[PDB]
Scaffold this active site. Structure first.
Site, PDB file in Angstrom:
ATOM      1  N   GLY A 102       0.954  -1.252  -0.082  1.00  0.00           N
ATOM      2  CA  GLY A 102       0.040   0.008   0.097  1.00  0.00           C
ATOM      3  C   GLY A 102       0.858   1.380   0.096  1.00  0.00           C
ATOM      4  O   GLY A 102       2.098   1.279   0.133  1.00  0.00           O
TER       5      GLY A 102
ATOM      6  N   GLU B 214      -3.806   0.088  -6.176  1.00  0.00           N
ATOM      7  CA  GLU B 214      -4.069   1.121  -7.267  1.00  0.00           C
ATOM      8  C   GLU B 214      -2.475   1.240  -7.866  1.00  0.00           C
ATOM      9  O   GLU B 214      -1.540   0.968  -7.324  1.00  0.00           O
ATOM     10  CB  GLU B 214      -4.619   2.325  -6.790  1.00  0.00           C
ATOM     11  CG  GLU B 214      -3.930   3.012  -5.581  1.00  0.00           C
ATOM     12  CD  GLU B 214      -3.472   4.430  -6.097  1.00  0.00           C
ATOM     13  OE1 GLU B 214      -3.148   5.068  -4.878  1.00  0.00           O
ATOM     14  OE2 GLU B 214      -3.162   4.772  -7.196  1.00  0.00           O
TER      15      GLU B 214
ATOM     16  N   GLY C 221      -4.785   2.067   6.222  1.00  0.00           N
ATOM     17  CA  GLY C 221      -5.244   1.935   4.867  1.00  0.00           C
ATOM     18  C   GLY C 221      -6.017   0.745   4.535  1.00  0.00           C
ATOM     19  O   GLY C 221      -5.917  -0.256   5.209  1.00  0.00           O
TER      20      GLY C 221
ATOM     21  N   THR D 262      -5.505  -1.198   1.939  1.00  0.00           N
ATOM     22  CA  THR D 262      -4.509  -2.305   1.456  1.00  0.00           C
ATOM     23  C   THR D 262      -3.662  -2.661   2.567  1.00  0.00           C
ATOM     24  O   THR D 262      -3.412  -3.634   3.009  1.00  0.00           O
ATOM     25  CB  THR D 262      -3.943  -1.662   0.143  1.00  0.00           C
ATOM     26  OG1 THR D 262      -4.812  -1.649  -0.779  1.00  0.00           O
ATOM     27  CG2 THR D 262      -2.933  -2.628  -0.492  1.00  0.00           C
TER      28      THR D 262
ATOM     29  N   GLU E 127      19.079 -12.285  17.820  1.00  0.00           N
ATOM     30  CA  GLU E 127      19.566 -12.313  18.859  1.00  0.00           C
ATOM     31  C   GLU E 127      18.957 -11.469  19.824  1.00  0.00           C
ATOM     32  O   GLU E 127      18.643 -11.880  20.930  1.00  0.00           O
ATOM     33  CB  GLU E 127      21.230 -12.105  18.951  1.00  0.00           C
ATOM     34  CG  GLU E 127      21.766 -12.907  20.155  1.00  0.00           C
ATOM     35  CD  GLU E 127      23.274 -12.732  20.180  1.00  0.00           C
ATOM     36  OE1 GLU E 127      23.848 -13.789  19.347  1.00  0.00           O
ATOM     37  OE2 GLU E 127      23.900 -12.064  20.981  1.00  0.00           O
TER      38      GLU E 127
HETATM   39  N1  LIG Z   1       4.697   7.507   7.560  1.00  0.00           N
HETATM   40  C1  LIG Z   1       3.747   7.409   6.544  1.00  0.00           C
HETATM   41  N2  LIG Z   1       2.544   7.414   6.749  1.00  0.00           N
HETATM   42  C2  LIG Z   1       1.695   7.087   5.642  1.00  0.00           C
HETATM   43  C3  LIG Z   1       2.465   7.313   4.287  1.00  0.00           C
HETATM   44  N3  LIG Z   1       1.360   7.380   3.275  1.00  0.00           N
HETATM   45  C4  LIG Z   1       0.119   7.064   4.299  1.00  0.00           C
HETATM   46  N4  LIG Z   1       0.531   6.895   5.498  1.00  0.00           N
HETATM   47  C5  LIG Z   1      -0.438   6.731   6.546  1.00  0.00           C
HETATM   48  O1  LIG Z   1      -1.132   5.465   6.166  1.00  0.00           O
HETATM   49  C6  LIG Z   1      -2.603   5.520   6.432  1.00  0.00           C
HETATM   50  C7  LIG Z   1      -3.489   5.260   5.538  1.00  0.00           C
HETATM   51  O2  LIG Z   1      -3.025   4.223   4.529  1.00  0.00           O
HETATM   52  P1  LIG Z   1      -2.386   4.020   3.113  1.00  0.00           P
HETATM   53  O3  LIG Z   1      -1.355   3.484   3.267  1.00  0.00           O
HETATM   54  O4  LIG Z   1      -2.433   5.487   2.401  1.00  0.00           O
HETATM   55  O5  LIG Z   1      -3.700   3.297   2.114  1.00  0.00           O
HETATM   56  P2  LIG Z   1      -3.241   1.876   1.396  1.00  0.00           P
HETATM   57  O6  LIG Z   1      -2.566   0.926   2.171  1.00  0.00           O
HETATM   58  O7  LIG Z   1      -2.617   2.400   0.028  1.00  0.00           O
HETATM   59  O8  LIG Z   1      -4.905   1.348   1.181  1.00  0.00           O
HETATM   60  P3  LIG Z   1      -6.125   1.907   0.374  1.00  0.00           P
HETATM   61  O9  LIG Z   1      -5.362   3.207  -0.469  1.00  0.00           O
HETATM   62  O10 LIG Z   1      -7.265   2.240   1.059  1.00  0.00           O
HETATM   63  O11 LIG Z   1      -6.249   0.883  -0.778  1.00  0.00           O
HETATM   64  C8  LIG Z   1      -2.925   6.890   7.191  1.00  0.00           C
HETATM   65  O12 LIG Z   1      -2.628   6.744   8.501  1.00  0.00           O
HETATM   66  C9  LIG Z   1      -1.680   7.743   6.448  1.00  0.00           C
HETATM   67  O13 LIG Z   1      -1.438   8.823   7.496  1.00  0.00           O
HETATM   68  C10 LIG Z   1       3.717   7.771   4.081  1.00  0.00           C
HETATM   69  O14 LIG Z   1       4.304   7.787   3.050  1.00  0.00           O
HETATM   70  N5  LIG Z   1       4.237   7.568   5.339  1.00  0.00           N
HETATM   71 MG   LIG Z   2      27.151 -16.444  20.521  1.00  0.00          MG
HETATM   72 MG   LIG Z   3      -3.831   3.438  -1.382  1.00  0.00          MG
END
Ligand SMILES: Nc1nc2c(ncn2[C@@H]2O[C@H](COP(=O)(O)OP(=O)(O)OP(=O)(O)O)[C@@H](O)[C@H]2O)c(=O)[nH]1
Ligand SMILES: [Mg+2]
Ligand SMILES: [Mg+2]
Ligand SMILES: C=C/C=C\[C@H](C)[C@H](OC(N)=O)[C@@H](C)[C@H](O)[C@@H](C)C/C(C)=C\[C@H](C)[C@@H](O)[C@@H](C)/C=C\[C@@H](O)C[C@@H]1OC(=O)[C@H](C)[C@@H](O)[C@H]1C
Ligand SMILES: Nc1nc2c(ncn2[C@@H]2O[C@H](COP(=O)(O)OP(=O)(O)O)[C@@H](O)[C@H]2O)c(=O)[nH]1
Ligand SMILES: [Ca+2]
Ligand SMILES: [Ca+2]
Lengths: 426, 440
Positions: free
Chosen positions: B10, B71, B143, B145, B254
């Site tokens: 994701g 996506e 998210g 995903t 470890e």
């Molecule tokens: N530290 C960090 N957090 C992120 C980033 N992108 C998204 N997030 C966090 O991840 C969460 C959102 O999930 P995403 O990873 O964007 O969603 P996905 O896994 O792509 O899932 P869908 O888009 O719903 O298919 C939220 O809490 C965001 O603040 C990033 O590049 N760095």
């Molecule tokens: Mg050892």
């Molecule tokens: Mg996404």
């Protein structure tokens, strides 16, 4: 020729074992390529106890190097005397044992152990008269502890009438790699109680405290600890490696030192222990007093907290045997209460003319003392503090072990502690 | 031997993946085209960095990594960006339609259409390993995903690789950068589903990292880029033992032995120092003592919680750069005589130390000062359960009214899965209470 077959297993076992072979090779005048360059026939008289003779008058350590990962044996092979070992005697896997007795003993170790036994057999087969085996290992890890004790059991099955001797490094919270060391050590001690004839108990905290307090090493390394151990191992095997009357072989040593089969765990000691005055001449009286000083001993047990069943003392260097006998008699006559009275004349003294490299004289102490129970009590306490909450047990049950085996190991070591106590009061 | 395969899932998993792999390349002297002048063995090897990079005969060093997203637009930027030559196209896997912030779509509706392909691609990486050690899985809690597809993947990996180790880096949600009201649902669902399939999980609280960037780097309004560069330094500290050799180097496995006393209690708290701007670091060398002390400052933790109000079950210090044991030992001694460090009664109190001598690296255009030495503390503390408590409470508020639940039911889920997940979290919170209680 009374051959001894040497085995070193796991990280601790191979690092100490490598240093040991460095040290005694220098004593016997064997260089890193297996060629002899000494100047004394005393060096070769019993050389066959530890070395085989190859073509071209080469001497090769009767040594098998064992590990469940390649790293430490790679280092050994790349080390100072690494080329002296028989290449076929390096036996190793790739997956490691993860500081896990169960991995060493039941799963990963099980897959490797037959190949080790094949090399053990090859070495034994060429012996004119095999004495037995000496294993170097730690009890706190996975390979030396778990696979090391698996090896010992299988060797006993195949060679039931041969002596089994170990140099066993006991873990300490003060010089520790993982929290499960007391589990691994408790599991191993029960194996050693049943399947060795002699076990030299080396406590890593004692080694550290000697380096820090006495040798004034501000930050002791494993390397520093290992040179202490190597020097001690050289001293304790002096009677096996040079002409002599007392404890000249593994069985006669056991008969002298082990009055009851389970009580075969020894406290070793070495003198001199000198900080970098290092040129000062040492006297026999000073050697003798330091050799019996608790500060010079390596099980972190207070001898005055128990009694000596038996003691072997080995002096090395040109010195007055008259003075040695006088000084040894003095120690017994002035602290006679710490020697059990129901084993007459239980302190034996040997003298060897060849001193360790760079010393005029030295002394090594081997004590069978009931005070060793303190070491097992410490391990037992640390074991129970975790086991009562079954903490970290999943690492072991994941390899197929059940809790009952831990309960039995616990009971076994507490039995051993009780057995020492009864002879301390006898 | 000892290969590790990384899986980035994701948007959060992928973008954090971008930052980590860029940083690894800089640490090992690997160019964006994958060439590594210093590596004299072409097309293979068993060097330490080979745990994370395979090699082609043409001298390319290729991440042992799969990027997956439902996506295409985030991974398209990898496909078209600076390190595009680094990855074989088959390592970068995308669908057309994302999970719409819905665990159910990530795990079921949309995820099921791509899971077999993803496993086939992972198998291709596995087949090139001679001693695969395990997986490192990067994903958000929040998210669709990151939550749903990661759970599905972890379940399928347990089946296909058995008990081969699986470690997570999990991004815990914060309101400052969150994009969905339902992230607490997604978090509890994936935590419940993945719990039996993960050996060890490093939670990264976006709010903690956000605060650190604002406070320590003086960044007004941190972007994901700001957050991710910091996170990659922490991830790099943790994997450095795997990628570098050294006498005082201690393997992650470890530390893991000490960090996980029971299967479910497998969530270490990471604390990292120093985080300092170039302007503040200039002419100001931070010693081993200073960066060690900083580890026991809660402001520097990757998860907001208060260890001073909990009990320790383990403390590990992972140093890198100009650091020797003498200085470490002195620093630890000072700390033991001044800090709120209480252990449970069934655990030893010694700190476990590892030192990697390769100094920390930074990315060009970054916010962090280049420093001579750094440290990552990994502790097992009851305090981390605070993070679950906060999430579980937001879950309860919404679920009591069944707010948004129709989105999940519509994709085939049952209310039964919600209460089952929430009960598992209640049991986990209770597990953390129980391990902290003294022995009788
Ligand atoms: N530290 C960090 N957090 C992120 C980033 N992108 C998204 N997030 C966090 O991840 C969460 C959102 O999930 P995403 O990873 O964007 O969603 P996905 O896994 O792509 O899932 P869908 O888009 O719903 O298919 C939220 O809490 C965001 O603040 C990033 O590049 N760095
Ligand atoms: Mg050892
Ligand atoms: Mg996404
Ligand atoms: C740290 C002390 C080092 C040396 C001392 C001055 C002493 O040396 C002399 N010549 O008297 C020795 C004997 C010490 O008392 C020992 C405790 C030193 C010891 C065994 C271990 C230390 C922990 C370790 O750091 C080690 C690397 C340091 C020095 C060793 O090279 C010394 C030699 O080692 C031996 O094996 C033989 C006995 C002999 O040749 C010995 C001179
Ligand atoms: N004296 C000494 N102790 C060691 C050394 N290496 C490890 N240890 C100790 O051995 C135990 C760990 O076992 P180790 O031999 O590393 O595990 P293995 O490789 O699975 O046998 C711990 O008690 C360590 O303190 C060493 O080189 N010297
Ligand atoms: Ca196997
Ligand atoms: Ca190479």
């Amino acid at each position: 020729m009374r051959e001894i077959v040497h085995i070193q297993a796991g990280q601790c076992g191979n690092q100490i074992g490598a240093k040991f072979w460095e040290v005694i090779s220098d004593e016997h005048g064997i260089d890193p390529t297996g060629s002899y360059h000494g100047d004394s026939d005393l060096q070769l008289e019993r050389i066959n106890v530890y070395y085989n003779e190859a073509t071209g008058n080469k001497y090769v350590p009767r040594a098998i190097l064992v590990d469940l990962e390649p790293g430490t044996m790679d280092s050994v092979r790349s080390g100072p005397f690494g080329q002296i070992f028989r290449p076929d005697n390096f036996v190793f896997g790739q997956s490691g044992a993860g500081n896990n007795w169960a991995k060493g003993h039941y799963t990963e170790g099980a897959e490797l152990v037959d190949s080790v036994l094949d090399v053990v057999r090859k070495e034994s087969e060429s012996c004119d008269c095999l004495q037995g085996f000496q294993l170097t290992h730690s009890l706190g890890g996975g390979t030396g502890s778990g696979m090391g004790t698996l090896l010992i059991s299988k060797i006993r099955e195949e060679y039931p009438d041969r002596i089994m001797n170990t140099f066993s490094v006991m873990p300490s919270p003060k010089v520790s790699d993982t929290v499960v060391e007391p589990y691994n050590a408790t599991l191993s001690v029960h194996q050693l109680v049943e399947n060795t004839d002699e076990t030299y108990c080396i406590d890593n905290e004692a080694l550290y405290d000697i380096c820090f307090r006495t040798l004034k090493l501000t930050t002791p390394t494993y390397g520093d600890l290992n040179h202490l151990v190597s020097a001690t191992m050289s001293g304790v095997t002096t009677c096996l490696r040079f002409p002599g009357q007392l404890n000249a072989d593994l069985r006669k040593l056991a008969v002298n030192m082990v009055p009851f089969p389970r009580l075969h765990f020894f406290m070793p000691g070495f003198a001199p222990l000198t900080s970098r005055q290092q040129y000062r001449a040492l006297t026999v009286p000073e050697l003798t007093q330091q050799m019996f000083d608790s500060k010079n001993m390596m099980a972190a047990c207070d001898p005055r907290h128990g009694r000596y069943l038996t003691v072997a003392a080995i002096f090395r260097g040109r010195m007055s045997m008259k003075e040695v006998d006088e000084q040894m008699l003095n120690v017994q006559n002035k602290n006679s209460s710490y020697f059990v009275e129901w084993i007459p004349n239980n302190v034996k003294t040997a003298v060897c003319d060849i001193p360790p490299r760079g010393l005029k004289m030295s002394a090594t102490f081997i004590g069978n003392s009931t005070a060793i129970q303190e070491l097992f009590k410490r391990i037992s306490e640390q074991f129970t503090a975790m086991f009562r909450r079954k903490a970290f047990l999943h690492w072991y049950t994941g390899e197929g072990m059940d809790e009952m085996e831990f309960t039995e190991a616990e009971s076994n070591m507490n039995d051993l502690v009780s057995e020492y106590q009864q002879y301390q009061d006898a | 031997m000892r290969e590790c395969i990384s899986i980035h899932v994701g948007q959060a998993g992928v973008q954090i993946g971008n930052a980590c792999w860029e940083l690894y390349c800089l640490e090992h002297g690997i160019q964006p085209d994958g060439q590594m002048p210093s590596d004299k063995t072409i097309g293979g090897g068993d060097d330490s960095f080979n745990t994370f990079f395979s090699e082609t005969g043409a001298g390319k060093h290729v991440p042992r990594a799969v990027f997956v997203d439902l996506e295409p637009t985030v991974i398209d930027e990898v496909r078209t960006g600076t390190y595009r030559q680094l990855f074989h196209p088959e390592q970068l896997i995308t669908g057309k339609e994302d999970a719409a912030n819905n665990y159910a779509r990530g795990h079921y509706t949309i995820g099921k259409e791509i899971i077999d392909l993803v496993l086939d691609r992972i198998r291709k990486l596995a087949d090139q390993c001679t001693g695969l050690q395990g997986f490192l899985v990067f994903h958000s809690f929040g998210g669709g995903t990151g939550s749903g597809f990661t759970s599905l993947l972890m379940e399928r990996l347990s089946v296909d690789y058995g008990k081969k180790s699986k470690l997570e880096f999990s991004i815990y949600p914060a309101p400052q950068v969150s994009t969905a009201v339902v992230e607490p649902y997604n978090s509890i669902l994936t935590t419940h589903t993945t719990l039996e399939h993960s050996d060890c999980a490093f939670m990264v609280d976006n709010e903690a990292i956000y605060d650190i960037c604002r406070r320590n780097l003086d960044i007004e309004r941190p972007t994901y880029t700001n957050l991710n560069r910091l996170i990659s330094q922490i991830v790099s500290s943790i994997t450095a033992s795997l990628r570098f050799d050294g006498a005082l180097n201690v393997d992650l496995t470890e530390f893991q032995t000490n960090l996980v006393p029971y299967p479910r209690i497998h969530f270490p708290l990471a604390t990292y120092a120093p985080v300092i701007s170039a302007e503040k670091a200039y002419h100001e060398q931070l010693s081993v003592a200073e960066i060690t002390n900083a580890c026991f400052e809660p402001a520097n933790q990757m998860v907001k919680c208060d260890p001073r109000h909990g009990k320790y079950m383990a403390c590990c210090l992972l140093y890198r750069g100009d650091v020797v044991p003498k200085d470490v030992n002195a620093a630890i001694a000072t700390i033991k005589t001044k800090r709120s460090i209480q252990f449970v009664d069934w655990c030893p109190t010694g700190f476990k130390v590892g030192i990697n001598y390769q100094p920390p690296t930074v990315v060009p255009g970054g916010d962090l000062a280049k420093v001579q030495r750094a440290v990552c503390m990994l502790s097992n503390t009851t305090a981390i359960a605070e993070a679950w408590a906060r999430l579980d409470h937001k879950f309860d508020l919404m679920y009591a009214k069944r707010a948004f639940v129709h989105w999940y039911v519509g994709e085939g889920m049952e209310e039964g899965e919600f209460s089952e997940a929430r009960e598992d979290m209640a049991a986990l919170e209770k597990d953390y209470e129980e391990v902290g209680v003294d022995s009788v």
